[PDB]
Design a protein around this nucleic acid. Structure first.
Ligand code: MG
Ligand code: MG
Ligand code: MG
Ligand code: MG
Ligand code: MG
Ligand code: MG
Ligand code: MG
Ligand code: MG
Ligand code: MG
Ligand code: MG
Ligand code: MG
Lengths: 59, 59, 96, 126, 136
RNA sequence: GAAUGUUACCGCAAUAGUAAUUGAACUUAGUACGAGAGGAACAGUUCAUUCGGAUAAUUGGUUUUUGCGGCUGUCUGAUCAGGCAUUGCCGCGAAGCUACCAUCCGCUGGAUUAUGGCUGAACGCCUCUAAGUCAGAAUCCAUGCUAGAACGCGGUGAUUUC
RNA sequence: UGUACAACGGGGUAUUGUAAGCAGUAGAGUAGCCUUGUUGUUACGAUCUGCUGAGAUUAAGCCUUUGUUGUCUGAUUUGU
RNA sequence: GAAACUGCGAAUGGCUCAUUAAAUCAGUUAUCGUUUAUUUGAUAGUUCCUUUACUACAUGGUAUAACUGUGGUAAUUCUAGA
RNA sequence: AUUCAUAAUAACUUUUCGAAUCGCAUGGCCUUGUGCUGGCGAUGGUUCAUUCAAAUUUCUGCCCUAUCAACUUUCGAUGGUA
């Protein structure tokens, strides 16, 4: 899917196209507002932690 | 590690405070520091002429 | 963790709760095979290699199990392990 | 694999166990076994059947706590630039606030200007 | 099934032999469908041709509009009430027997379906899926 | 099941039986072909029909588990706990048995028929045929599967004393 | 005369659905008494609540067993 | 002076005659039986609440749109995160 | 015609309202401070009245049919109390 990531300390924001489904399976069964560690979805985001703030499904 | 679009760059807030007490608490001035000269002015050029167009202080 | 898989990862043997009905325990090595085979329980069974090479895109499928049932076959079993049974039911009068 | 809950008794439903029933109003009921399915069909109230989760909850038996509340005592404490003013400028303005005599100087000059203006108006009339 | 089927279907436990009267789930004006045949059914001595979820049947309208009665039309079974097993292992069943009126190509006579429809029927017939409300 | 020295175990295989079947969808492909209208097939994939052999993890059925609970009438002074009502009746009900009402499984080699061919005379040419020969059907025979001749056979263990 | 077998017993597993007994300021109410209550007491009262997912049953073709108690040389026949 | 917030208005108008036979409606009453934005005219020295610090009255608090930026769906006067 | 208008007592409120709003003009008095006063408006606000309304309402009045003579009242029909 796509990841609309925002860093509000700098106010910056960027989308990342993410493939390779076993790294996006860490997002599954997680509610909006729960925090997930970034090293599971990628070693590029290793040491990061994201809070799920929203999103859009297909359609 | 630092991300290229999120943690490297920064974007400024678009507007400064408009209410007098909002300016006074944004800058931590005083009871009486005459907030009229701590107003954020955004320099803009129409042609070769430039002007600052600060906000109108409210309350 | 004979009955455990990589997805389950709760250590338990292949033996169902209370033992296999009319058989007992599986303290030895075993062959889990899909479906049903002739014979009843406790019967000597001979297992033979295939007499031909079968491709069929069904003989060649690699199988990785996700979960193995270890609930009791002596009834409508609800719990896979006594630990899970205890966690669901809380403490009882026998438990002190 | 997902473990379902019995709609009558609250028992955990492992794969391939029990039955599923779709009522005519498109509502889904799951039963771990024929006992709970038959009780539901006989229209028994689960709140009055002594071994169900609903009964034990209503009668407060074997009470247990999941009582987890997470509240963040979070103050952002973050400072950022504004388009008109850079962070360095903001810091300078915050720094110079104590003991400002600029207000006094301006007031005096301005008071003089007001007096001059009032006089100018009188002169213009005459 | 037959011509207008989009894909195949796993075997569902047959619950509607010939002579069965199922409710009519659409808004065509029919109240029930009396099953007289099953499309694609096999042959066996004394065995009644029986229909399952997602099957195309040939049916008559026993109760309903006079322009719909006294003639044979295709129908599609959308609710089964006899329990059947999916390959994910659930035995499920609806509360009633229901089908909708269709042409031989699979397009519905009506434009709306009341109640739920089966997922196996919705995948097999796309117009049933389009006019269906909730799919289970 | 007597008799093949006795008794035991592991085998061989004469002969006899034998089984799988049919369709749809996707793709090939709106392609070949055709002025157009229309409109295939081979290979591949996913399923299904009829049949067959098992099996009972699950789902459902069955209930003298007379296992637990409930209910009527009467009898045991009452209570408790029971008897009787030809299994008193009702709900649930393990186990066993069982259902295309449940699940699993159902092999690949050779030889041929029709037919199409090769070489090649008869008949200086030609010809699938006469001599010789290639490919070929849900056919046949094997592989495989079931019994094992109670007068078919082999290997091996042990073989009694007061 | 033993990682022996059995009968019991214990544990597990399953079924049902909360045992008898005791207690209660629960209980539609209805009677008696006075020290005429502000839980008045006594009596009766389907039912309710607690002890109590309790009690009962559980191999007869369920699993298991450091427990208890026992059992372990009767008959007939067979030889190249 | 766009946008957007806020306030008004969108219950007027215009159309039709399906229903409706003590219903509508007409003329005549009643509100000592009630609601009423707006117009018009009048009309709130008392409000620091243990009312001595609690309290700024030369005037206290929080958002949020528009906007910037990142986006999703074939599609709608759809909207999400920052 | 009133238990009316209005007023007074004891309280009650989970508490309403009693201007932290906007434009022009900027003048007078001095203890000359950004001191004190100060005009014409705009919007808002409690209640009463008024206006524009609304809702119920009194009396009398409607075509053809008895090949409609009894209708209403379980499930409000007519009245009473709350
Ligand atoms: Mg079983
Ligand atoms: Mg017949
Ligand atoms: Mg043979
Ligand atoms: Mg069978
Ligand atoms: Mg059953
Ligand atoms: Mg059974
Ligand atoms: Mg030739
Ligand atoms: Mg008791
Ligand atoms: Mg209890
Ligand atoms: Mg001993
Ligand atoms: Mg006014």
């Amino acid at each position: 899917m796509k990841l609309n990531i925002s860093y509000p300390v700098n106010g910056s924001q960027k989308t990342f196209e993410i493939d390779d489904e076993h790294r996006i399976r860490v997002f599954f069964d997680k509610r909006i507002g729960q925090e997930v560690d970034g090293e599971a979805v990628g070693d590029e985001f290793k040491g990061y932690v994201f809070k799920i703030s929203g999103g859009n499904d297909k359609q | 590690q630092e991300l290229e679009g999120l943690t490297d760059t920064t974007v400024p807030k678009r507007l400064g405070p408009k209410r007098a007490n909002n300016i006074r608490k944004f800058f931590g001035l005083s009871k009486e520091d005459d907030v009229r000269d701590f107003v954020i002015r955004r320099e803009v050029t129409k042609g070769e002429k430039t002007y600052t167009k600060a906000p109108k202080i409210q309350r | 963790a004979n009955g455990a898989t990589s997805f389950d990862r709760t250590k338990k043997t292949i033996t169902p709760m209370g033992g296999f009905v009319h058989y007992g325990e599986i303290k030895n090595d075993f062959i889990m095979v899909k479906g049903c085979i002739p014979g009843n329980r406790k019967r000597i069974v001979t297992l033979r290699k295939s007499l031909y090479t079968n491709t069929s895109r069904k003989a060649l499928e690699e199988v990785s199990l996700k979960w193995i049932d270890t609930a009791s076959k002596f009834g409508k079993g609800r719990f896979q392990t006594p630990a899970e049974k205890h966690a669901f039911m809380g403490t009882l009068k026998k438990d002190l | 694999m997902k473990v379902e809950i019995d709609s009558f008794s609250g028992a955990k439903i492992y794969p391939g166990r029990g039955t599923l029933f779709v009522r005519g109003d498109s509502k889904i009921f799951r039963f771990q076994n024929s006992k709970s399915a038959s009780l539901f069909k006989q229209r028994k109230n689960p709140r009055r059947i002594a071994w169900t989760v609903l009964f034990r909850k209503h009668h407060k038996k074997g009470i247990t706590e999941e009582v987890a509340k997470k509240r963040s005592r979070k103050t952002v404490k973050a400072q950022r630039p504004i388009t008109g003013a850079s962070l360095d400028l903001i810091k300078e303005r915050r720094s110079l606030k104590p003991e400002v005599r600029k207000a006094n100087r301006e007031e005096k000059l301005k008071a003089n200007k007001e007096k001059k203006k009032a006089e100018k108006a009188a002169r213009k009339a005459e | 099934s037959g011509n207008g089927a989009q894909g195949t279907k796993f075997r569902i436990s047959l619950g509607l032999p010939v002579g069965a009267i199922m409710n009519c789930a659409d808004n065509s004006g029919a109240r029930n469908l009396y099953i007289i045949a099953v499309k694609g059914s096999g042959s066996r001595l004394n065995r009644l041709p029986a229909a399952s979820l997602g099957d195309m049947v040939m049916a008559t309208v026993k109760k309903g509009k006079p322009e719909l009665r006294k003639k044979v039309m295709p129908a599609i079974v959308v609710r089964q009430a006899k329990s059947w097993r999916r390959r994910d292992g659930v035995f499920l069943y609806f509360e009633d027997n229901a089908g909708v009126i269709a042409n031989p190509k699979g397009e519905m006579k009506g434009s709306a379906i009341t109640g739920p429809v089966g997922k196996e029927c919705a995948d097999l017939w796309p117009r049933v899926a389009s006019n269906s409300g909730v799919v289970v």
